[PDB]
Amino acid sequence: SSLSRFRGCLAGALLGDCVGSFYEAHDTVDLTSVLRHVQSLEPDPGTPGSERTEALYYTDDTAMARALVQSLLAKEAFDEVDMAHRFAQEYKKDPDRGYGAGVVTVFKKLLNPKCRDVFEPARAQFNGKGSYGNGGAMRVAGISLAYSSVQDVQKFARLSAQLTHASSLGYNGAILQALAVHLALQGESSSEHFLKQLLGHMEDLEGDAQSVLDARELGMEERPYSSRLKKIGELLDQASVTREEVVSELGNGIAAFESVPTAIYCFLRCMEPDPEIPSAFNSLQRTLIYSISLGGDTDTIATMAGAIAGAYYGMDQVPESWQQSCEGYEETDILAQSLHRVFQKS
Numbered sequence: 001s002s003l004s005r006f007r008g009c010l011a012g013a014l015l016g017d018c019v020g021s022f023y024e025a026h027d028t029v030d031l032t033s034v035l036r037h038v039q040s041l042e043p044d045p046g047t048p049g050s051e052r053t054e055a056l057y058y059t060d061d062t063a064m065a066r067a068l069v070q071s072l073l074a075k076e077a078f079d080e081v082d083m084a085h086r087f088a089q090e091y092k093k094d095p096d097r098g099y100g101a102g103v104v105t106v107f108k109k110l111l112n113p114k115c116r117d118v119f120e121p122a123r124a125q126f127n128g129k130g131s132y133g134n135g136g137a138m139r140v141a142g143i144s145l146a147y148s149s150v151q152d153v154q155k156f157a158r159l160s161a162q163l164t165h166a167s168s169l170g171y172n173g174a175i176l177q178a179l180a181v182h183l184a185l186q187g188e189s190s191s192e193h194f195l196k197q198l199l200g201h202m203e204d205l206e207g208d209a210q211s212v213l214d215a216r217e218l219g220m221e222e223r224p225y226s227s228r229l230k231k232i233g234e235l236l237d238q239a240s241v242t243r244e245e246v247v248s249e250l251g252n253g254i255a256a257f258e259s260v261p262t263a264i265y266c267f268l269r270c271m272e273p274d275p276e277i278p279s280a281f282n283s284l285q286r287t288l289i290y291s292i293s294l295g296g297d298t299d300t301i302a303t304m305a306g307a308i309a310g311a312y313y314g315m316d317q318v319p320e321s322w323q324q325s326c327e328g329y330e331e332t333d334i335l336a337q338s339l340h341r342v343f344q345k346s
């Protein structure tokens with residue numbers, strides 16, 4: 001059902017944040033360690049729920065995702081002023097959730113009720129060049145639950161990201177992540193078709209003059225997203241790719257272009273079984289485990305891979321033992337059901 005996909009989307013994102021935050025900024029993560037971390041969430045056979053109820057705290061990924069969804073519900077539409085002020089007020093209420101070091105400046109400016117233009121603080125970041133961080137993408141999944149057409153998904157993924165990420169290196173990653181969640185909601189089962197659809201959009205977007213200018217500020221590659229999506233096509237066809245090669249080809253970092261394609265690769269790769277991951281796990285669990293085993297920005301890569309996998313596999317593959325380990329999981333589910341009731345209905 002679509003309700004199952006909405007609930008699974010936000011729960012998968014919560015799972016990625018809460019489980020992956022344990023490994024944040026670890027340059028190397030052992031797969032066995034991740035397996036043991038999630039095995040520790042399981043109660044004895046016969047006991048419902050989690051062995052560690054709400055023991056895994058969420059971070060800024062979830063705090064901002066919740067503010068974004070709460071704005072969409074409050075206004076029953078994207079409203080940039082409402083969402084900007086909700087981001088600022090959420091940061092003020094609970095600043096110690098692990099926010100990016102730079103974006104805090106934006107939140108502080110947006111606390112001013114006489115800030116006339118809520119996009120101006122983001123435009124000022126990094127000497128006016130804009131943030132390329134993955135914070136615009138980590139929170140964007142709600143956009144793809146609220147809006148059904150790809151035109152609207154792109155439009156409002158971009159605007160919602162531009163409240164904090166004015167560089168196209170940041171907001172194009174948010175658009176790519178929103179498009180991937182959108183495709184997963186449609187049940188797109190062919191990894192080739194999934195990639196082809198994303199690539200068509202990203203080549204169009206990265207042809208824009210300002211997108212090229214933003215990318216050239218950082219280095220030689222002018223189409224960071226399109227280049228990585230083509231790499232993903234190649235990687236998926238290899239019988240064996242090491243984690244080291246995956247990270248070398250795509251990244252595992254805080255930059256949106258070093259994390260959003262990686263999350264997409266993890267989802268597409270873990271459609272198939274993995275001999276290193278016990279067969280008892282389902283495909284959503286496999287996706288989260290593998291993504292965290294890549295290391296780096298594990299909380300955000302896992303929250304994005306989990307949003308996609310949750311939208312694709314639905315709540316049936318969200319295990320209660322994992323879900324009920326996450327701080328605020330009931331509120332997350334209520335928010336997902338509310339988005340469904342307001343925007344989707346059946």
Ligand SMILES: Nc1ncnc2c1ncn2[C@@H]1O[C@H](COP(=O)(O)OP(=O)(O)OC[C@H]2O[C@H](O)[C@H](O)[C@@H]2O)[C@@H](O)[C@H]1O
Nearest residue numbers: 098099100101102103126129130131132133134135254300
């Ligand atoms: N144009 C830029 N130039 C130089 N450094 C940059 C630039 N853009 C980003 N940085 C660096 O990128 C950092 C973060 O960018 P930020 O906009 O503050 O916030 P986020 O919301 O995207 O957080 C990104 C992730 O960081 C945490 O893990 C969070 O949980 C996110 O998962 C800056 O402090 C800079 O060092």
Ligand SMILES: [Mg+2]
Nearest residue numbers: 059060061299
């Ligand atoms: Mg975080």
Ligand SMILES: [Mg+2]
Nearest residue numbers: 297298299300
């Ligand atoms: Mg992070």
